[PDB]
Symmetry: C3
């Protein structure tokens, strides 16, 4: 009544209009497909960080990726989607208008080429990838119940505001003119600086794997690193290629850029390791470099000329390779790989987007931007820096607050203090904890949960 | 001559008309993509059931998934497609009109938005997923030749009739008004009750892994469980999302429901295990719960409001969790996991579809239904029960008949009787069977086929 | 100025026209999706050949697949794309017009239904699959630096010319009328005969695994074989299905053919092994047969009637099964599996395409061909043979030249001579090479690179 297209609410009355008429069906099919591709990046992250670990994590990140997929999907449905994409938000956050996905259907989303329900599906996958990045960063000696509560809270008060600033209809970064093609800020810079908060507050200090004369690379499982990298690169075609919101050739241009940045990042990191080790070929390095390039090109993929995409592989690979060395300086391992690749890689990529963004690339699908230094738009670099600094500051500060607030509550403490924690070898001698004898997650039906030595 | 569109046979003469003009190209692209996604669910099933096993299966289900993909594709081509989708069937079964895919081309399929050849591709994947569910259920001490013959026969006389009733142009369940969005009946309820027939006739009784004080969860490979769950959830976006037959936003709505049911099922099953174990976190349970939710939402995904999808995770997870305990009561392990997840999960999901189906959800793409209890259509619940009971009865009874008929034929007996079966350790002492020494499927070039101790 | 559609260069001025208007958006979405599917075939190849190996390769092919993805993407960007698809080539090769992808944007590609940038993305994946086939063939005792240089050179002077002849606007095989639906020549026949050059020049002679009374199948990792086969079959829907360049039902017809050829190839090879071993069931054989069928149907998938696709499984499976036996005759293992499956399978499939190609199948999307023997076009078989012989001759001869030229240059020698190579067990006793003690690529951060025993 009339139930005709309004652009608001459900978008119209399904008994009176065909809501699908508002959209190009091929745009919808590509974004649906891209959503499925981003989903498989979730276990990709878990495999990557499980495999790279220089320490025996009690919690399997391959499995924790499924836990994160579950917690993030629930959070997104409950209020995460609404806090980012409620068509009625301020400049800093959305509302609870779409609590439990109420009225999320056929109105054109903030990306007008797809309906709200499909944009919900697609963007929810980005929240889930960020959730497993966070769980991976904070996995060492994590308690599962508190971790699940942490992820729910963290998505709500760290991810959702940063996502709103970046993608929301009235988000202040959107208004300012900052560029972030595929959500490098909300996903990579954000998780990376939240990881750093974890490292500096909850991470083990004077860590034996980061102390003195120790190997920079000492992986738990190279096959897991490689499988994770495979799922990440495969899924990243949806992550970046879908960020146009359409079936135009800007989507395919972004995929060409994505592939070339990954390729040049992998080769660059491996070449850097070759020079720095005096001629060794680094198995872990090739994979880390591909990830550095993928992260680097994320804010840029639909904005920069193809030939510049090689720079988004080379420069993040070099800078991230050296950022990893800060683990030796601080003597901290926990959380630091996620910071180095996603935090530093995300910052570098975001900065370089201000240099290389071009109006003629965005215009491939009619997207209008002033451009970067390629168009003599010098001020763009300042907009990029404003975004990167705001994301880093909010993520680091608020993540610190959550971690410490939960730490002060006995039943919510994410990681027990070392002096209250019982040894797995001692638990295994007790009848009611005999299952701690199987310290191998391949055969154990139960998570080897940290137990307080007061029971 | 005139070779113009007829809606029958090949659909028209390719030299005179463009058969593609009858279809929206984006509808076709989504269903082609969804077909590829369902294909990877085949090894997903094999990985899941290989990993969950409390017993050392001689046959690797990861590998058997490829065998099933081969047998099912051949059966479908030969006559399986025709027995379900020959446009000229009765109310109970199709015909051999499309034997060897004769004349399967460009006529609109029973799903009018895609041509016969594409519907053939898509629906063949559902047959193959059901084949590996059956092979998984019946894998313990299976002989490979007889298993392949069994799958061919089973697809023909169990899967194909149930699929016809559900999807066929004149299928009696279609006519009755029963709802089954993505083939929960033909795939999950069917394989589950066929699994139960296997359990009760060919399964080992008084099984040491299901007898007395034994662990409910004791997996062969947690990494295999997790990898299988990953492939299943990823592919299920095609399984459910493609069941609209189109590129409309009902496809994406169904994907949102699919993700939320998996997420809530995983969390629910793990929470149930936490209460029942006195505080342990169940690795296997999270995965089983995700599968329970995916199975649960299958008959419902394109029919129920988004907020109700959480019920399709919670309720099947709880009921299936307790159904697994029946293995202890019966002291039977073989085949029972497939029954618990797919049979019970499928029954529960089908029943709840009668409660929660809504005309306004179906109408998102113009699909007309009376609805469920959400629309005060009380009779819908009875239609659902008629379907579930018919599927369970046909599958259990006919599967029983096939298993027992083959059992009475020496060269077709699927599983040897324990007293006619030689020990692998004894075979390994014989020169012509020395390869039985390698009881590890990771390195052995040959299937460790059960051998009769009469040679 | 006018910047309107020209069909050349960038295709038009993005500030004046919408380049996307020239294309059906659904055609673009399918080819973008198919590109992502072909990408995952890259690690599929690496997993397959790592797993099948009868020898302990020091270089992990699962990991080397990522290296190949990187080298091939860079080569393709640099000049590979231009040498195949520069719209201004001769009959034998393209030009450097599109060096570093200059002006590769929105002009219709040689496949007029997609723009240059998307055809670039898609076809680059084929180059990368061929790169990992080559790296796999030549992996035994390979040195990594020289291997990377080799792949770059090989793509440039072996792959690119053969691809031009097959796909290029003025390619001589195109003009002749030879049929090759999905690039069986450039990918499979080519890599297979290049593998044979490797086998005969650099392969180990009188190899203990191929000498005397030794097992035909003795795999390193069955799980790797199966995982590789899964990724290959899944991705092959894009490899073959995308080779129409469009969203028509010829794409889906090609997928039905692809699935049926894989299925019948797997069953055929396993049945052949069953007869030849006196009743054993071959784990490796089922997988090899699926690959033989997939290779076989590649030149044919969009040209042959569905019922004939079973022949493209059966015949290549039988012939390739016996081709593998030539390893015993020659007493050479290295490189020979790639030759047997891709070289022989590719030759057989190409030949049979001349028998079974049908004008009415090509015409499903308006593609005009004279057809094969199915249309009494007898001369087609000669065109097929001209293509197969030219590919085999160029690949074998030029690959031989490259391998031998690099062999004569100390720092480019791909494989050290056995008498200049130090033992891993001896390197491990030296302090600066202690890491050679860990001969297990699952835990070692470094490639166990062959070292000259002159340092
Ligand atoms: C525990 C947290 C309970 C929060 C549930 C309240 O949601 C409400 O729902 C309305 C639409 O559903 C919104 O308009 C409104 O803003 C919001 O307050
Ligand atoms: C443990 C999981 C808890 C989440 C599931 C509860 C979702 C609450 C949403 O409320 C529902 O929203 C509809 C909007 O249309 C209303 O019409 C309906 O009356 C109301 O019931
Ligand atoms: C979706 C939320 C699931 C419940 C989250 C509640 C806060 C964390 C509860 O976990 C706690 O962890 C302890 C092990 O350290 C367990 O001994 C104990 O049983 C449990 O109190
Ligand atoms: C630390 C987070 C800072 C985010 C807000 C700063 C910019 C506010 C712009 O207002 C318009
Ligand atoms: C062994 C089984 C052999 C069955 C092959 C016979 O198929 C026949 O093919 C016709 C169209 O091809 C159909 O019209 C007809 O109904 C069917 O009988
Ligand atoms: C071991 C695999 C056996 C399956 C392969 C045999 C398929 C038999 C199909 O018959 C063919 O159907 C066409 C329909 O158009 C006829 O035109 C053609 O004359 C006829 O030959
Ligand atoms: C596609 C069908 C493939 C053949 C199926 C025929 C029925 C089963 C044959 O397998 C049998 O299994 C025995 C091991 O138990 C083997 O010793 C014996 O060789 C073989 O007689
Ligand atoms: C046990 C299978 C029962 C299926 C047939 C029962 C319903 C027949 C409806 O006819 C109309
Ligand atoms: C090291 C190899 C350096 C080769 C780079 C030269 O590329 C040139 O670029 C032009 C368009 O960019 C082409 O028209 C021209 O043919 C080509 O010669
Ligand atoms: C180690 C990786 C080396 C590859 C990266 C160098 C790519 C060289 C391409 O040249 C660039 O091509 C543009 C075409 O538009 C010109 O406009 C621009 O002026 C020019 O700079
Ligand atoms: C993208 C190209 C990367 C460099 C390729 C240059 C040619 C091969 C160089 O590798 C060589 O391999 C030796 C081990 O055999 C190493 O000891 C030595 O450091 C190095 O000289
Ligand atoms: C050995 C490679 C042979 C390729 C060229 C031979 C055919 C040339 C056709 O000219 C037209």
């Amino acid at each position: 009544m009339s139930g005709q297209f309004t652009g608001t609410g459900t978008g119209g009355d399904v008994f009176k209009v065909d809501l699908n008429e508002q959209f190009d069906r091929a745009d919808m099919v590509w974004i649906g497909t891209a959503s499925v591709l981003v989903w498989i990046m979730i276990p990709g992250v878990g495999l990557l960080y499980s495999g790279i670990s220089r320490k025996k994590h009690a919690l399997s990140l391959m499995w924790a990726a499924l836990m994160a997929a579950c917690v993030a999907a629930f959070q997104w449905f409950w209020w995460g989607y609404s806090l980012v994409f409620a068509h009625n938000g301020s400049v800093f956050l959305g509302t609870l208008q779409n609590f439990c996905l109420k009225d999320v259907l056929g109105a054109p989303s903030i990306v007008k080429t797809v309906p709200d329900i499909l944009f919900c599906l697609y963007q929810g996958m980005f929240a889930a990838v960020t959730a497993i990045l966070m769980a991976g960063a904070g996995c060492e000696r994590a308690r599962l119940g508190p971790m699940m509560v942490f992820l729910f809270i963290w998505l709500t008060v760290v991810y959702c505001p940063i996502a709103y600033w970046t993608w929301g209809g009235n988000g202040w970064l959107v208004s300012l003119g900052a560029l972030d093609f595929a959500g490098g800020g909300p996903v990579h810079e954000n998780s990376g600086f939240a990881a750093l908060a974890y490292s500096l507050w909850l991470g083990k200090r004077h860590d034996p794997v980061a102390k003195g004369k120790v190997p920079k690379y000492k992986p738990h499982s190279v096959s897991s690193i490689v499988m994770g990298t495979i799922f990440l690169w495969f899924g990243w075609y949806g992550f970046n290629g879908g960020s146009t919101g359409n079936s135009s050739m800007r989507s395919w241009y972004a995929c060409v850029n994505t592939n070339l940045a990954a390729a040049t990042g992998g080769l660059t990191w491996m070449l850097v390791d070759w020079f720095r080790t005096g001629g060794k070929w680094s198995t872990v390095g090739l994979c880390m470099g591909a990830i550095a390039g993928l992260v680097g090109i994320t804010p840029a993929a639909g904005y920069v000329p193809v030939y510049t995409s090689v720079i988004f592989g080379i420069v993040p690979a070099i800078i991230c390779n050296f950022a990893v060395d800060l683990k030796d300086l601080l003597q901290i391992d926990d959380g630091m790989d996620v910071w180095a690749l996603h935090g530093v890689g995300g910052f570098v990529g975001n900065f370089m987007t201000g240099l290389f963004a071009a109006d003629y690339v965005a215009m491939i699908d009619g997207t209008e931007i002033d451009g970067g230094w390629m168009n003599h738009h010098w001020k763009q670099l300042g907009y990029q820096l404003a975004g990167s600094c705001a994301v880093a500051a909010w993520s680091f500060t608020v993540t610190s607050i959550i971690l410490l607030a939960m730490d002060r509550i006995p039943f919510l403490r994410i990681r027990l203090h070392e002096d209250e924690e019982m040894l797995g070898t001692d638990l295994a001698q007790i009848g009611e904890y005999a299952y701690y004898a199987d310290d191998d997650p391949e055969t154990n039906p139960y998570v080897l949960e940290p137990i307080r030595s007061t029971t």
